[PDB]
Design a binder for this molecule. Structure first.
Ligand code: CU
Ligand code: CU
Ligand code: NA
Ligand code: NA
Lengths: 229, 229
């Protein structure tokens, strides 16, 4: 299995912490360098937490599970046409394959794959996910993938992690960000199989991740040629 | 496939209509006759609605889908030991098989099977489910399976279907009723397969259903030897 040693978090003067109705905590940063734009969430995922199946059109994504435990779901089919939803009423629901993550495992998921994750354990677990802006849709406004704007719609800001705020979108807002997001687990899903296709297993893009880590570390060193916010 | 012509609803002077956070509407009645105790819900299930996977210990259940459409999930494994939850932390999650229901299809699910259902379509659909009290646990207080008491905990009463009430348990209350109820879809689930095992397909108990329909119809005729409430 593929592992990665560390994905650091950009340290912002005022972090963006988002709390969701699923009681997840997202610590989010957006960064840019001359050649690259991305966003990163360092997340705490309670039992049952995690995103329902969804498909990205404007970013490629990495998931990194420092303690394993998190179960990810991933298709072998790609869904290159955002206008064709994988639902009963239209194109058809898809088949997903589960991944039981291991400590420091790195899961790369390119655009157009259907994926999600859940914490199926009885204890809260960490996960990091990284969105790198791809080459699609020059008119899309968010050069980092829009992670900060997207998540601001799905729950309140945490001004105190010691005193969490009350709760009141995850699905309905999504297409504005080039995401087809399901609102219930079985909306886009025909089957779930625990037999992992080798082709999913092999997906990797360490090169771009290493570049984003360089940017993050440069930012944290005070380097003014990159920015995170 | 197995069908049934009609399962009538007992007409109560004051119906118990329950509204849930999933926006489902349950019209519930409890009945008894000398030989039998049961409860019945005539339900309206919006898109994405339906119960997450669960297992019963004190009732046997029937599902009847007048218009089809509803997708049901069902195990081949039975889970006879209520103390052993089918979770990551303990016994292990289970395999479920999907059923794409047809108009008037009758699905019989004995105690100890894991099951659930969802509306995967874009339109609200009807479903009827019937709980018949089994022979287990003489000290269990609810001679009809406790459907009315159980559902009263999961959402408010509808005093006007034209003006639905605001919303605020489905999982946490369940064991009091001999139900192990999952709070998220993948909590008890390892796989979902769309290849239906013949053994599930063959489950039936028309005899007991016919008896409950007799009771319901007798009640609706004014017959005082049976009661519904
Ligand atoms: Cu994603
Ligand atoms: Cu049930
Ligand atoms: Na690409
Ligand atoms: Na039995």
């Amino acid at each position: 299995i593929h592992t990665f040693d560390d994905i650091p978090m950009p340290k912002l003067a005022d972090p963006l912490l988002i709390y969701t109705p699923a009681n997840e905590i997202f610590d989010i940063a957006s960064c840019s360098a001359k050649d690259i734009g991305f966003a990163i969430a360092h997340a705490q995922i309670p039992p049952g937490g995690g995103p329902m199946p969804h498909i990205h059109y404007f970013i490629n994504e990495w998931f990194w599970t420092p303690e394993g435990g998190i179960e990810l779901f991933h298709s072998t089919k790609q869904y290159p046409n955002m206008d064709e939803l994988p639902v009963v009423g239209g194109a058809g629901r898809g088949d997903l394959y589960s991944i039981q993550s291991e400590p420091k495992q790195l899961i790369y998921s390119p655009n157009h794959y259907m994926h999600g994750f859940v914490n199926p354990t009885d204890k809260t677990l960490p996960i990091v996910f990284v969105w790198m802006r791809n080459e699609v849709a020059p008119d899309f406004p968010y050069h980092d993938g829009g992670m900060r704007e997207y998540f601001q719609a799905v729950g309140p800001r945490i001004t105190d992690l010691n005193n969490l705020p009350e709760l009141t979108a995850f699905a309905s807002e999504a297409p504005k960000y080039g995401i087809n997001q399901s609102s219930y687990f079985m909306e886009y899903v025909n089957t779930i199989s625990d037999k992992l296709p080798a082709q999913i297993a092999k997906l990797k893009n360490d090169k771009d991740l290493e570049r984003m880590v360089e940017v993050i570390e440069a930012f944290n060193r005070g380097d003014k040629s990159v920015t995170c916010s």
